[PDB]
C-alpha cells in the first residue's frame, strides 16, 4: 500500500 | 530534502513540453510521484502519479492521454509530458512525492504564440 | 469520481477568533482526508492528513476532524501568519480531488 497524501 | 523543478517554460500552442523534478533527499524508486496543477487564481488539479518502481500509473480523466508520467530512476528524477497544449493548460506544475515531503518549487507553463 | 465540496470559498473574521472550515465529500473516503495552506504566494504546505494527524511544524492552533463524509478543519485563535488558501484532499480512491479552496482573509 502506498501513502495517501502529497 | 527538496525537489528542484524545471524552469519556466514558454511553448506554441498545440505544442508538447516534458516538465521534470529531481529528488534530493530520497530515492525516486521509494515513493509514488504525483503532479498537480494550478491555473492563474484557481485551485488545485491533481494531474495523475506513476508508482513506485514503475510501476502502474495513474491519472486525472481530463488529463487522460493528453498525459503522460515517467521517471528516469537511475537519474532519481521524474518527468510530465503534455500534449495539444492549449491556451487552458497555461499553469503552475508541481511535482511532489507521497509521503511527508514538501513539493516541488513549481513549474510555470505558458501556453502562447 | 469523488466531489469534494469544501465552504466556505472566501471567510473574513477578526483576529484571534476560531475559524472552521468543512469540506463535504460526494462518497465515503474513510479517513483518507488531507488538508493543505498556501500562502499568497508560494507553494501548499501540507498541515493535516489522515483528517486529523497533525504534521510536524504546523502550529498546535490547527486541529482536524471528520469521517466517513464530514470533515472540519478548525483553526483556534487566528493569527496574522494564517492569512492563505485551504484546500482538502482526498486520497481514498483514484483519481484523487482537491476541494475547491478557501481564501481566509483577516478583518482588521
Known amino acids: 500500500t502506498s501513502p495517501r497524501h502529497l | 530534502v527538496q525537489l528542484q523543478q524545471s524552469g519556466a517554460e514558454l511553448v506554441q500552442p498545440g505544442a508538447s513540453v516534458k516538465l521534470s523534478c529531481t529528488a534530493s533527499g530520497f530515492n525516486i524508486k521509494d515513493t509514488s510521484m504525483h503532479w498537480v496543477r494550478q491555473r492563474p487564481e484557481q485551485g488545485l488539479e491533481w494531474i495523475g502519479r506513476?508508482?513506485?518502481?514503475?510501476?502502474?500509473?495513474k491519472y486525472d480523466p481530463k488529463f487522460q492521454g493528453k498525459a503522460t508520467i515517467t521517471t528516469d530512476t537511475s537519474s532519481n528524477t521524474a518527468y510530465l509530458q503534455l500534449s495539444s497544449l492549449t491556451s487552458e493548460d497555461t499553469a503552475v506544475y508541481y511535482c511532489?512525492?507521497?509521503?511527508?515531503?514538501?513539493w516541488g518549487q513549481g513549474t510555470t507553463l505558458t501556453v502562447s504564440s | 469520481d469523488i466531489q469534494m465540496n469544501q465552504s466556505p470559498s472566501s471567510l473574513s473574521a477578526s483576529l484571534g477568533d476560531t475559524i472552521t472550515i468543512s469540506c463535504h465529500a460526494s462518497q465515503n473516503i474513510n479517513v483518507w482526508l488531507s488538508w493543505y495552506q498556501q500562502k499568497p504566494g508560494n507553494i501548499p504546505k501540507l498541515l493535516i492528513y489522515?483528517?486529523?494527524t497533525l504534521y510536524t511544524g504546523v502550529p498546535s492552533r490547527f486541529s482536524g476532524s471528520g469521517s466517513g463524509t464530514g470533515f472540519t478543519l478548525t483553526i483556534s485563535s487566528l493569527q496574522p501568519e494564517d492569512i492563505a488558501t485551504y484546500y482538502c484532499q482526498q486520497g481514498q480512491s483514484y483519481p484523487w480531488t482537491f476541494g475547491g479552496g478557501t481564501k481566509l482573509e483577516i478583518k482588521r
Open positions: 506513476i508508482a513506485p518502481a514503475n510501476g502502474n500509473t
Open positions: 511532489s512525492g507521497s509521503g511527508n515531503y514538501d
Open positions: 489522515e483528517a486529523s
